[PDB]
Amino acid sequence: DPLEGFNRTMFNFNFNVVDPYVLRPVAVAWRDYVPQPARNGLSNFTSNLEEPAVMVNYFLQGDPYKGMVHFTRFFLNTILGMGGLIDVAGMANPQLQRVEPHRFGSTLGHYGVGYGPYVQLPFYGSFTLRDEGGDMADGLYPVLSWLTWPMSIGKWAVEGIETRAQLLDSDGLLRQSSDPYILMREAYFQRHDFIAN
Amino acid sequence: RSDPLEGFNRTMFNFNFNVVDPYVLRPVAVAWRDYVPQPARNGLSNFTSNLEEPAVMVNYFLQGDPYKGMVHFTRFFLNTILGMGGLIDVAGMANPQLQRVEPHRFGSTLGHYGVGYGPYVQLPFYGSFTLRDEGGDMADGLYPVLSWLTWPMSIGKWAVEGIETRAQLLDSDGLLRQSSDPYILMREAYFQRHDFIAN
Amino acid sequence: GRSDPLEGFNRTMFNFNFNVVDPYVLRPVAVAWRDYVPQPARNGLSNFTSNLEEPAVMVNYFLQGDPYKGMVHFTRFFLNTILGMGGLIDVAGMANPQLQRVEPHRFGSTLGHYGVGYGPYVQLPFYGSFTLRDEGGDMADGLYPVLSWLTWPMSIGKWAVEGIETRAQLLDSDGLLRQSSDPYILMREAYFQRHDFIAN
Amino acid sequence: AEIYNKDGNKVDLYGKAVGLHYFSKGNGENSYGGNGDMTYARLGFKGETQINSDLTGYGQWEYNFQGNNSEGADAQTGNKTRLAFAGLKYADVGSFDYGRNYGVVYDALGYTDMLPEFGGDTAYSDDFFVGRVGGVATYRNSNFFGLVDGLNFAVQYLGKNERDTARRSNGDGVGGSISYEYEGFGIVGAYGAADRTNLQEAQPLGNGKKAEQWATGLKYDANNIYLAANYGETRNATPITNKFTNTSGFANKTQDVLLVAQYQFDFGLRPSIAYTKSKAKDVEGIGDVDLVNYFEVGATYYFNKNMSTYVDYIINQIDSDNKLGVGSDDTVAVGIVYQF
Amino acid sequence: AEIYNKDGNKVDLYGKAVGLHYFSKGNGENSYGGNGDMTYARLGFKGETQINSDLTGYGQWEYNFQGNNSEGADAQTGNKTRLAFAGLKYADVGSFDYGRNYGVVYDALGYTDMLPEFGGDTAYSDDFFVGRVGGVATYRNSNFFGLVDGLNFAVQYLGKNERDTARRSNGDGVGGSISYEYEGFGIVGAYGAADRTNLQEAQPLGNGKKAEQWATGLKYDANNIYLAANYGETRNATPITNKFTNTSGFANKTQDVLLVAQYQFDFGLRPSIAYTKSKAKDVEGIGDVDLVNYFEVGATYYFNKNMSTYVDYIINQIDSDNKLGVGSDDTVAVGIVYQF
Amino acid sequence: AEIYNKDGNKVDLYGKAVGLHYFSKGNGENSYGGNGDMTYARLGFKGETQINSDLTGYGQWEYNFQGNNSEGADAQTGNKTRLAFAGLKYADVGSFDYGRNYGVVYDALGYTDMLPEFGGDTAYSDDFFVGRVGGVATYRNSNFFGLVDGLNFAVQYLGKNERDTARRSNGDGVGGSISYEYEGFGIVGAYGAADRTNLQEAQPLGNGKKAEQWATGLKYDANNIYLAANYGETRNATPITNKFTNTSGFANKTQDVLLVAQYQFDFGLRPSIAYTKSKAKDVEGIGDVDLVNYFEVGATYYFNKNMSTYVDYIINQIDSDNKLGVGSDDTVAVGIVYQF
Numbered sequence A: 001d002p003l004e005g006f007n008r009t010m011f012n013f014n015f016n017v018v019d020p021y022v023l024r025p026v027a028v029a030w031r032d033y034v035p036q037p038a039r040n041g042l043s044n045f046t047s048n049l050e051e052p053a054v055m056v057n058y059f060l061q062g063d064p065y066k067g068m069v070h071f072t073r074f075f076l077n078t079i080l081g082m083g084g085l086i087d088v089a090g091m092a093n094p095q096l097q098r099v100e101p102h103r104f105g106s107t108l109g110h111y112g113v114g115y116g117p118y119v120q121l122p123f124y125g126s127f128t129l130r131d132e133g134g135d136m137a138d139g140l141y142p143v144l145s146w147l148t149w150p151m152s153i154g155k156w157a158v159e160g161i162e163t164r165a166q167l168l169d170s171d172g173l174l175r176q177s178s179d180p181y182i183l184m185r186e187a188y189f190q191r192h193d194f195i196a197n
Numbered sequence B: 001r002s003d004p005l006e007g008f009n010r011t012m013f014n015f016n017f018n019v020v021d022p023y024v025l026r027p028v029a030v031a032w033r034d035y036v037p038q039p040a041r042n043g044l045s046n047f048t049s050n051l052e053e054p055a056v057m058v059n060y061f062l063q064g065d066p067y068k069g070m071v072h073f074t075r076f077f078l079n080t081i082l083g084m085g086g087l088i089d090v091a092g093m094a095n096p097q098l099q100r101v102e103p104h105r106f107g108s109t110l111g112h113y114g115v116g117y118g119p120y121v122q123l124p125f126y127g128s129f130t131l132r133d134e135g136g137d138m139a140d141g142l143y144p145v146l147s148w149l150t151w152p153m154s155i156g157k158w159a160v161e162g163i164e165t166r167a168q169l170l171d172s173d174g175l176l177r178q179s180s181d182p183y184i185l186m187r188e189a190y191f192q193r194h195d196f197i198a199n
Numbered sequence C: 001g002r003s004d005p006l007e008g009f010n011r012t013m014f015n016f017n018f019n020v021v022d023p024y025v026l027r028p029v030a031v032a033w034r035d036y037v038p039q040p041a042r043n044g045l046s047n048f049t050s051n052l053e054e055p056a057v058m059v060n061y062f063l064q065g066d067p068y069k070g071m072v073h074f075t076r077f078f079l080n081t082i083l084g085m086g087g088l089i090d091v092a093g094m095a096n097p098q099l100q101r102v103e104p105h106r107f108g109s110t111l112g113h114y115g116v117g118y119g120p121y122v123q124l125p126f127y128g129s130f131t132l133r134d135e136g137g138d139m140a141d142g143l144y145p146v147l148s149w150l151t152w153p154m155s156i157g158k159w160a161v162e163g164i165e166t167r168a169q170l171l172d173s174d175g176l177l178r179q180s181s182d183p184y185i186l187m188r189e190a191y192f193q194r195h196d197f198i199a200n
Numbered sequence D, E, F: 001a002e003i004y005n006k007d008g009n010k011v012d013l014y015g016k017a018v019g020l021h022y023f024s025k026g027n028g029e030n031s032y033g034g035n036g037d038m039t040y041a042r043l044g045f046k047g048e049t050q051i052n053s054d055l056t057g058y059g060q061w062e063y064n065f066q067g068n069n070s071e072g073a074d075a076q077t078g079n080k081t082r083l084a085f086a087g088l089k090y091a092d093v094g095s096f097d098y099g100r101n102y103g104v105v106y107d108a109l110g111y112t113d114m115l116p117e118f119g120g121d122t123a124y125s126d127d128f129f130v131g132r133v134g135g136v137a138t139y140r141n142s143n144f145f146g147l148v149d150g151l152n153f154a155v156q157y158l159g160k161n162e163r164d165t166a167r168r169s170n171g172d173g174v175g176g177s178i179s180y181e182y183e184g185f186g187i188v189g190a191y192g193a194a195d196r197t198n199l200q201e202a203q204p205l206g207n208g209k210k211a212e213q214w215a216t217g218l219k220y221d222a223n224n225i226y227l228a229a230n231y232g233e234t235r236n237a238t239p240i241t242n243k244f245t246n247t248s249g250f251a252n253k254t255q256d257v258l259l260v261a262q263y264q265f266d267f268g269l270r271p272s273i274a275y276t277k278s279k280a281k282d283v284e285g286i287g288d289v290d291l292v293n294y295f296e297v298g299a300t301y302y303f304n305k306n307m308s309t310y311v312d313y314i315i316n317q318i319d320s321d322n323k324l325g326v327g328s329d330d331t332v333a334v335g336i337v338y339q340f
């Protein structure tokens, strides 16, 4: 952790001002006024744009099975399920149940590549080079390639407000630990390694 | 009971009872019961009772009973189209709330809204007659279905219905000959029946 | 004792048939048949040739006054010809049992039905048994359809293939005739026992 | 086949698939029946609901899908609805059904319309009361309201069909029939008359403001034996078409005779022989001319109530020089039938 | 109707046979509905499979066979497949089906389309979103994702069908509807808009690059009583045809009003009354002109759930000198119906 | 579905409703598959009666109802009967059926006819023995009369169909096929020849008194895997159409190759890749020219035995300057399918 000094700084900016004054209020508004069918209807839709990328990426990892599983997700949900708003593939099989995506970031880490320094950015939060920034490769080919740069920042934000709400309970579970920066960096590496391996 | 022209009626009733019946009507009714087969009989009394069904509907509306009034529409509709122009009681075979019932024509509408008979009269060859009901029912002759009957057909409808009635009575046809004053029975029977309908 | 005018000529032609034309010619051909020809093919062909006689068997049953059997053999021909691939498959007979293929009753039996007689019983070389009434009297059916439409190649072909099948089926019972005192008298008594049954 | 029967309504969805071939000289142009592939299928339903002890409702629809068309431009050729009607049946009082249904003179012509493929030559479609026609209301009563046993009658009203071709048109009309059947024997007669449309009148062949058809029948039907005969006459009703002058229209008069004898063997075959002649009269520019004239020998083999096959040979007794052009060659049909 | 139900797939084969007749003055050319035989049949299947606790797959097809055609050249006249689509339904999340199906503006016009034979005059077939049209994808959701009870909505997409006639063609479009239903009462509105074909734009009647249709509806449907009313307007959508100039096209505008009242007597008869008016506006060479204007009185007798009969009298209040040519004589229908 | 099975006769009433859309650049006229709505439904019956231990009678009829027509003038465009035939199956001896049924070279061409929507480009309808055709008699036998297991043959007779268009006509003919199937593997070949109609001979494109079609196939069909390949050649049989000169006729020769690979994942998806090329030869005024040339990537999702969905992408590898005019743009189809 080279930039441990810098990262702790941007984590404070994030933990103690941009979250409780901005992100966490915006997320509270989301939880109260957006009706549930709309909320999971929206994350069904944004996550559909990643399914062709995950299919391509599981092929590049030598798992044609899971790669065609995520094809099926995209195919079934775009065509029958109203352009990704309805999860027919999951209502279909339990083997089509949505799981969290495996993008180029994981293809690098599957084929052995490391990250670099774990950095913490203001307003972004956590960032590594291999996974974030490596997932941008999936921006070079269709569905994710068709998103204008306004559409990307919107998908970032809509997803951001959703995830940020889906943590409003374990809110204090981070606020109640001696070093909440190191729990937040160990939770990042728990999730990001689990995916590649 | 009030009966003003009782003197005239009884003589005119006796003409009907003692000469015009046993010499004319009762032999004709015997011939009818003897030669006309039953499918033929029920085909005509359904058929003639159909020409009154639209009138019985119209008069039931005028009394504020759209229900009963709409039943008789159903009778006419079903029996005319499906029942071969009224020969077949498709409506009666259909529902029990549609069973053929006694007609409610203009006489009953008058008596419903308070009108009386004034005097009971009895005519030769005609039989019992009131102004309100008989002849007051002639109002229905001024408008559809019954407006389409020429006076041959009208006297034909009256005549055929009557001969049928007399044939059905050929069994009781004699229990009335065993009663002290058969004028007062077939006068009280007229008001018994005509009140029940009007109420 | 039966009456056999041409007994001398016949006994000679029978030895030609029994002791030379059979072991040297017919009987090898019959071995070939059962050794190489498959059964679907074999009973497929006996159905096919026995069909060409079915219309004749029908006409002759009418002339014998049995229109019932006569309409049976129509049905045989009709069903087996159209549905049974031109007579290859015995659909009649798979259908009803009263439609089972039976031995033909042609003009020979129709003459004998009306009691005609055979004349002298003859035996011919390469032919085998021949009488005037039945063999050759059956030729009358060659004058009217199905059998009327057969070319003289097809006629001798139907004759030959039917014959080779018959002879192949006999390849087991073979020795039972080679062990009999006077096999000319058995093989002609076997003819009349058979031909009377059809004619009567 | 009855495929539904629940809560007092039962539905028979029925059909057949018929493989047909016709053999006749050359192209078949001068044949009774033509030449070539004739395969067709049929689908329909007969429905019947028990409203109560007196009332039975019924309805029926039946279509003819031709199997002998290509999947291209000609696909619909010969496809048609045959029957489409609903009605009510009253206790002993009879029945009344309206729609597209059999004309009443078929109550008589059906006697002889018993052949495996052909026959019934006078029961023309779309021709007043002798075949199926559109817009008929039919009262029928069997056993004369419960009185006379085996005595049926029926009376029919024909709503005018002003169509595009004179051939298929008709005016307002009415007809009827009575049949008596007693111990295998049956006798029947029927008559109808109707107006001709203006279009039918403006046809070269046939003249008259009114068209009429009647026919009579005898039948014996018992002990595996079937013998039946029909006599009838038409005025201004039989569709005729003069092949030489390329005109259509109607024959001013025709006499019609049909005979049929069939036995049903227990081993399955129902052979049939039959004779049919329809002589027209007073034909514009021709005079007297035959329309139908043949003997038939045919047979049907029944595997079971679902599978059968038949041959039907028409020995066509029509002349080489028929003044209207009716074909003079024989035709023989061979069929295999799966029905349900 | 349900004739198969096994391994979570169930199949409903349904139909009817309707003997129909129309009565109108003279030949019927100047009628609301015409005159003569109107008998038809109907066949279809509704299939539905329970894939799992959330998924029900479904498909449905429905055809119209006319009983009033002859068996000759006209045999196919009026025959058409009406509906043909398949789809998926998700556990209180909605439904999705593509094919030939009802357009979305019918979600409102259905309120008043309850007459025995006629009515529902604005729900034209092949007319953007008001009737059955080909090539629509439809999302529908009932009870708003399980939350709001009785609140349905639906959103629909119209793929262009560039056909041979302007009348039946259409461009790309989209529409939607929302209804609320609560204790016998119902309110609904719906709207759609689409591009017009170059064919439709090159028409004498009608102008605009976009066709647009909306309608709104109220109903009370409880205690044997049925009352319903519909108002809507079209811009460039109602197909009109000017009888004098023999031109086709569309009305640039119409305001459409429809009302219906019916009672259901327990003894079987369902009388009906209705008023319908369709006023066109800004019509080429005419201006304001009525398209539909009548009162209706009618009734149906229900023998049981399978057999019925009806009469429907249209008091046609269209003017005698209607500038577009709409027929001004009355029409009355009599029908008998067996269905299954 | 089997909707009747009683007293030794069972009837399967089957159908499907297919919501179909084809996407191709622009109007789709220069596409592999066209552009727009492609929805259709299908209805049929398959019936089979048990006559006895040796005899089985059978019949079958199948129709194609187009969902992509209007209810107007075009209602019947593309509607067709596909199959209509009856026959008998005998014990070991085989089976024989006559009617409208698949041609014998499809006994080989079916190997590669497995794509979700397209493929099977050489199995033309109404085209001698490669597709569905009218008036064929077909003997088939399984396991060589019980002797050789997995060895089938079939012999078929094609009766002349002199229709109105050269495209759908044909003369008298005959053909056959052999298959051997043994543990996932299958080998098949078939050949037929027939006379060409005088109309067919009088076409600009294509010449020869005789039409001829043959094809051979290998398949592996096991372990959730399906691989198959087809080679064949035609002489004077493949219908061709020159879009530039607006003449049709036949290709004097074609060499035809089809390949198919598919896997069936246990969670429901069946991906598909396939290659098809059909090159014609000796074409009047053109010479050698491609007719079909593509790779296909597609997939089918199977919800259960009754509900499915598919996308079928044709990467159309055919030229811009095709001398016959074959469209060169890709086509991708999307389907949702309810069948029963």
Ligand SMILES: CCCCCCCCOCCOCCOCCOCCO
Binding pocket: A064, A065, A068, F263, F271, F272, F273, F297
């Ligand atoms: C055009 C599509 C090409 C991609 C398909 C290629 C074939 C992929 O084959 C993979 C087969 O693996 C199946 C074995 O199953 C293992 C996983 O299943 C375990 C269940 O949880």
Ligand SMILES: CCCCCCCCOCCOCCOCCOCCO
Binding pocket: F153, F154, F155, F174, F175, F176, F177, F191, F192, F193, F210
């Ligand atoms: C079970 C095997 C299937 C039987 C197939 C029979 C196919 C028939 O082949 C006939 C061949 O005729 C084609 C003509 O080819 C040109 C030769 O003649 C040219 C002009 O003389």
